[PDB]
Design a protein around this nucleic acid. Structure first.
Ligand SMILES: [Ca+2]
Ligand SMILES: [Ca+2]
Length: 291
DNA sequence: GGGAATGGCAGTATTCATCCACAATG
DNA sequence: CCATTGTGGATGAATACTGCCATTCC
């Protein structure tokens, strides 16, 4: 139950944190400010480590297979705000944080208890996440601006990347089938997935790491990006050294370790033998979704 | 003591992680 | 022919994010 490096924490928050402002009609209006991280059960240790680092927030069972860290206590939200002022987000979520902070200022002056303050908060919430609800849209009609200044920041350091990869990353051992034979070959893959809205950040991964490609997929109004590396030299020389030096967190750390085992076997060309390929096929079976 | 704050979850939509096919390349 | 590398395909659930009653407290 250790504590997490602050920049790793910011990286993970950029990946899977959420800043919320919630307004519902009571009988007037109730207003709540909340930071939330929702993860699969297997990574409850992450939430505990985050909790151990901030000394705020509650950890709750969320359904059958998920757990959540909730921070709603107003005094405790100060702790969060101060962290992200010293170690700032760099994805578009930073915009949500800014609005989160602006709403915090309104409530600190107790102005959410007056009608004029509510109208300010509604304007803020309109630009946050999924925006206003239909209750709010009906109660406050017209086109409330959803527009928001676009965030354009570089990756601060590798500690941030390790936190962000701990959330959005993928370390895969792939068995390549061909058509004229039945023997399979091994290929290692590193991937990072993200919505198109952070296209500039994703493209910078190529330069920042020194390898890889950016691919886009599109399904109706759905689209996302994929930073992808396959060339073994780059994976062995440019990806593995980075995460060995900057440690991952959660279950995905164990995936990276098994990933490196396979890489060492490929490096020693033991994967072209049959005792080696067998051990690799075993390691593949028990990592990622197989674990 | 009534409402404001916070706890304590369950719910919903999708942005992710993931396993995979097949073509291209030397 | 073999081994590596490239370009995404396609999936479904782990996320992001939200809704609301219960409890605290002041
Ligand atoms: Ca994310
Ligand atoms: Ca994740």
């Amino acid at each position: 139950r250790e504590s997490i490096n602050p920049w790793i924490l910011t990286g993970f928050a950029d990946a899977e944190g959420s800043f919320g402002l919630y307004i519902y009609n009571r009988n007037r209006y109730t207003t709540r400010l909340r930071f939330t991280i929702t993860l699969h059960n297997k990574d409850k240790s992450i939430l505990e480590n985050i909790q151990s680092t901030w000394k705020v927030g509650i950890i709750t069972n969320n359904g059958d297979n998920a757990v959540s860290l909730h921070v709603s206590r107003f005094e405790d939200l100060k702790v969060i705000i101060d962290h992200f002022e010293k170690y700032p987000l760099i994805t578009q979520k930073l915009g949500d944080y800014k609005l989160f902070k602006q709403a915090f200022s309104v409530m600190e002056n107790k102005e959410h208890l007056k009608e004029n303050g509510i109208k300010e908060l509604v304007r803020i919430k309109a630009k946050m996440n999924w925006g206003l609800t239909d209750e709010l849209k009906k109660a406050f009609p017209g086109n409330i601006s959803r527009e928001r200044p676009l965030i354009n920041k570089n990756i601060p350091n590798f500690k941030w990347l390790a936190g962000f990869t701990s959330g959005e990353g993928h370390f895969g051992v792939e068995l390549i089938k061909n058509s004229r034979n039945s023997r399979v070959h091994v290929r290692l893959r590193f991937e990072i997935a993200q919505h198109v809205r952070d296209k500039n950040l994703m493209n910078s991964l190529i330069t920042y790491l020194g390898c890889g490609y950016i691919y886009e997929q599109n399904y109706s109004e759905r689209s996302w990006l994929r930073f992808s590396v396959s060339k073994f030299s780059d994976i062995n020389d440019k990806i593995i050294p980075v995460f060995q030096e900057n440690t991952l967190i959660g279950v995905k750390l164990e995936d990276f370790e098994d990933w490196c085992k396979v890489a060492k076997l490929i490096e020693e060309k033991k994967h072209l033998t049959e005792s080696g390929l067998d051990e690799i096929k075993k390691i593949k079976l028990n990592m990622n979704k197989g674990r």
